[PDB]
Design a protein around this ligand. Structure first.
Ligand SMILES: O=C[C@H](O)[C@H](O)COP(=O)(O)O
Ligand SMILES: O=C[C@H](O)[C@H](O)COP(=O)(O)O
Lengths: 263, 254, 263, 254
């Protein structure tokens, strides 16, 4: 099956930022033809730790910027929703509607996404056990979703820390396609006080682990200059490093693929 | 004064709310030093299963809670799940409750704060005690003046929650602290530990306790495994008041 | 039943330190006659994080110092053993043989302690679930132990942190008398790099919780000047604060006692 | 070269050790680029139950391991539980193993280091990756020169272990790292995850893998639920060598 790579800047800092990242993602989609790329960027960071942190320029602006990316580069689009009313307008541009981790159990949000006819990707809550995602998928199927993804993004491990239990990949595979979030899984929740931290040095090794275990795609936030990012400045991957990372996981996926267990 | 938030988990019917409300009113008259607040959700918006009981809607719920307040003169509290619900709920709710999974949703907090009502935020199972400082700041920014933080357990491995009592004194630095005695013992995805842990909460020191109670928990449509039998409420309240009376002498300052 | 208070300096820094603490503990035993005091101090810190940290002055010296305390103040004694061969010599002075947390599953150590005829107190391992202590008690009974205690001292919660799950008290009570370790439960394992950390501000509130829930005794390390201690300098209670703490828990225990559940 | 430590969990009989040893010798000849080390415990000193299988004693065990080394020319490794055992075990053991629960027992580490043999310390389930730096220092202080640290899971709630693969690169800063593929999936107080996680270990990067194997795990007297069927060992070794070959290109320096 075609491997999915969901990538883009964490937040829609500006339409300009999007086109800059989109251009590179488009270049890679032409090179890695065996990969299905989906451009990701949040029109709103509705769950920042601090009231003073950057949120975004609004739904309207965001959808417009994302539409420009799709129009200019012919790339599929994905963005996350935070309340039920956002599903409809977002569905006009998003090929995949993303459900935030903290909201993976909010029935109406899932239902709103499902009835749009678009694919739905649910970030597994940091509080959820792998087997608890079966009911999440059930809700989505009940709501009409035909293409469902479950994203591993770490689990609460003590305070301000997340651990990735790779046993989750084969477990969740029982009921949906699985995506590994390489950038949020290394973040340190509320690790900086008013903001969350992260350990960039672990992004690559853990993504290698994900493809060796086996998944249907990877999710990576990337920014031309992470240090200047307005969100997840500590975990976004420098855009120049994206190509090498993707080549690496495709290579590891290929050699490991013959050993992937049948669910 | 010490806060006691009690009531049936879900508004299964205003009939149920009236039966539970009568007992709470009674206790209310017996324990004058305690401020009682009637709680019940008009919607269980986060059930694990799509086939589980959610409720009868916001309108029916607000109406039923209206009945309780008017008929018994008891303050009211219920939780909201999306921003638009804040205003209509604030019509009857003296305290707007923010769900644990939603404790970081900025717009929900701001929406609640804007109503002018008191706001009680359930501490997310993924949150550290010190991470709640930012939660309080959001509410203050939104105009909230009466802010509560509720301890309801922290993720401890899979399908289990642990109560780290160190959280009470930490959260007390920036808000009044409430201990949720019934959800803290639930196994995500029990009853025998409700009383022991509530005794610990008052021994450590908190500003109030949250307890879901139902005439027949066995038949409850929500949290059947952890809702306290109505008939046992009086005894537990008396017990925690006695422990608090003695222990309060040692509560640390700030 | 008579409430147990196990207290003393973490390590036997010197026979002088012991007599200084013993004197105060003796004074309190005369005041709190409803309490059974047991003087505690390790002749060896055999599991320090760093090879450079203080361990002790040897078994011989330690037993001699502990014997002096028992002889001079008529106090019961408890100390921990680390290898099977230490059970016999230690049993000559120790009324209660303590089994370290990391070693709570070492069959031969438990058996060695049990056959001495002395009481045995096992620190619950940071890796053990409350219900897993049933087999620990079974081993001890199998080995001849007639008086057994299980001590709650925290559970691994993420890295370098411990949490106290008070549900452990009523669970362990099903098969043994339960003791709450007020000082090790707030320590931060390896929190200082070459040594462990601790948060003294939580010792009192958590001990209040322990007696409200209900236990058969408490364990507290105390030192005339904690800041100068050679071990657990961050968690040992200042000796001057001991009396007030004990009075407080007896008061809370009394008022809460009528509500203690029957096992 | 890449290390592969394999063998039956417990020395149920030297007969068993010989059967497993023959297969390991065979693989040894087929995978010349891999350094095989035969492992088996002469005593399960930390079983949960007093009624569970422990072993036939140190003497019988050392004799059986002697047989394996002499008959197949395979290096040997076994664990010790008390200081006095280091010397006699070092007679046959090329690598002395330190149990996870005992990774902080200074005298056991020093005793092992004094023998002059290599020392492999199982990382305690209560230990953080960076906490192992001190463990290595103790061994170096004791004269140890060949030191290994083994990842075998970390306490994650009750009766469960999680493998935090971030540990591999962290521990690599001060010692060679081994990944225990069979104990990492055990539930304290399963099998389907052994292969997936071992693939991850080599994709991330480690200096070797530890795998308990038995002709008929179902009948094993120890770790029956997690011991790998002998017949599946070859396939898994070939698989991890292939993944390592490709992934090694990306292993981070130090
Ligand atoms: O991904 C979710 C959050 O927005 C995340 O923790 C980053 O936000 P913060 O830096 O405001 O905590
Ligand atoms: O209680 C056990 C230890 O000795 C504890 O962690 C304190 O030792 P450290 O400061 O050497 O880690």
């Amino acid at each position: 099956e075609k491997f999915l790579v969901i990538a883009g800047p964490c937040a829609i800092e500006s339409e300009e930022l999007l086109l800059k990242v989109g251009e590179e993602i488009k270049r890679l989609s032409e090179k890695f033809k065996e990969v299905e790329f989906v451009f990701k960027s949040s029109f709103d960071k509705a769950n920042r730790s601090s009231i003073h942190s950057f949120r975004g320029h609004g739904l309207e602006y965001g959808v417009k910027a994302l539409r420009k990316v799709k129009e200019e580069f012919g790339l599929k689009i994905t963005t996350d929703i935070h309340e039920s009313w956002q599903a409809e307008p977002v569905a006009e541009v998003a090929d995949i509607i993303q459900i935030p981790a903290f909201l993976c159990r909010q029935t109406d949000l899932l239902l709103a996404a499902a009835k749009t006819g678009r694919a739905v990707n649910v970030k597994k809550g940091q509080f959820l056990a792998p087997w608890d995602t079966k009911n999440v998928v059930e809700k989505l199927k009940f709501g009409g979703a035909k293409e469902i993804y479950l994203t591993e993004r770490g689990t609460t491990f003590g305070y301000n820390n997340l651990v990735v239990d790779f046993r989750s990949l084969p477990i969740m595979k029982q009921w949906a396609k699985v995506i590994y979030d390489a950038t949020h899984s290394v973040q340190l929740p509320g690790g900086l006080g008013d903001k969350s931290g992260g350990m960039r040095e672990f992004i690559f090794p853990l993504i290698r682990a994900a493809v060796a275990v086996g998944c249907d795609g990877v999710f990576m936030e990337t920014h031309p200059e992470p240090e200047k990012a307005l969100s997840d400045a500590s975990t976004q991957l420098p855009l120049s490093q994206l190509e090498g990372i993707i080549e690496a996981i495709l290579e590891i996926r290929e050699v490991a693929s013959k050993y992937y267990e049948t669910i």
